[PDB]
Amino acid sequence: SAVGEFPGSLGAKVFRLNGGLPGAKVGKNTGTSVKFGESSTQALIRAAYRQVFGRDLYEGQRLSVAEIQLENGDISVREFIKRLAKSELFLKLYWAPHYVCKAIEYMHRRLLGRPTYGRQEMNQYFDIASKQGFYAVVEAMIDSKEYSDA
């Protein structure tokens, strides 16, 4: 029952949309150039990038549409992570060049911060990869209940 616990000072830092996204409400009736909470959401998006892709991306590589939708509040952080993972950049960098099981293992470590416990998880994601594809494997890992709880 402690999956949602956060590792205070013992684990890696955690990023959340705790603060309201800028422009979420019409309370800031236009203008307001110094609307303070936007660096937090920019840091959140860049941290999600650093999570899914262990490093920062280059200029042409960022997903501007997904970024702006997440900033606007059309989608949640889960859907932003989903789109980053399903992005063809992830496909080219981490999925295609690798042995299939190695790719799924790295994907699981990357999208849950957790190496797979073993052959049960590997079999589930492996059947997913054989039947549907990269997109459905990423979808399954994102929509697994363990991801929701953590």
Partner 1 sequence: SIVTKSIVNADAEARYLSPGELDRIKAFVTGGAARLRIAETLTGSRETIVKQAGDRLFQKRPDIVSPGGNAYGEEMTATCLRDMDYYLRLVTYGVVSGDVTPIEEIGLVGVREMYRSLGTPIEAVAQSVREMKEVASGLMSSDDAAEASAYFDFVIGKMS
Partner 2 sequence: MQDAITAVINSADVQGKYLDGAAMDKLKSYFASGELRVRAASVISANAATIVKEAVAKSLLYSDVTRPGGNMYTTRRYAACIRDLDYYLRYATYAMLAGDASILDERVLNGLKETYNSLGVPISSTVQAIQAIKEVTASLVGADAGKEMGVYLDYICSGLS
Partner 3 sequence: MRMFRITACVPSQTRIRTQRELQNTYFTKLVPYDNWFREQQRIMKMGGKIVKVELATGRPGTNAGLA
Ligand X SMILES: *[C@H](C)[C@H]1/C(=C/c2[nH]c(/C=C3N=C(/C=C4\NC(=O)C(CC)=C4C)C(C)=C\3CCC(=O)O)c(CCC(=O)O)c2C)NC(=O)[C@@H]1C
What CA–CA distance (Å, rounded) separates 132 from 99?
A: 17
Nearest to 16 by CA among 50, 51, 40, 38: 40
| Residues in 128-147 that interact with partner 3 by CB under 8 A | 139, 143
**In Å, how far are 14, 17, 45, 149 from 8, measured between CA atoms?**
9, 18, 21, 17
CA distance 24 to 38: 11
Angstrom distance (rounded) from CA 110 to CA 44: 16
Radius of gyration of the chain (CA): 17
Find the binder of ligand X among 16, 55, 119, 145 (CB under 6 A): 119
122: number of CA atoms within 13 Å, CB side? 11
Any contact of residue 65 with ligand X (CB under 6 A)? yes
Q: 56 is written with which tokens?
A: 């920062």
From candidates 15, 73, 105, 113, binder to partner 3 by CB under 8 A? 73
Binder of ligand X out of 42, 61, 72, 148 (CB under 6 A) = 72
Residue span 1-30 as binding mask against ligand X, x where in contact by CB under 6 A, dash where not: ----------------------x-------
Residue 147 contact partner, candidates partner 3, partner 1, partner 2, none, CB within 5 to 8 A by sort of partner? none
Position 126 contacts ligand X (CB under 6 A) = yes
How many degrees, rounded to 5, is the angle at CA 27 between CA 45 and CA 18?
A: 35
Q: Does 99 bind ligand X (CB under 6 A)?
A: yes
Choose, by CB under 6 A, the member of 53, 66, 71, 134 that binds ligand X: 71
Q: Which residue ranges make up the site for partner 3 (CB under 8 A)?
A: 1, 4, 16-20, 69, 73-76, 79, 139, 143, 148
Q: Which residue ranges make up the site for ligand X (CB under 6 A)?
A: 23, 65, 68, 71-72, 99-101, 119, 122-123, 126
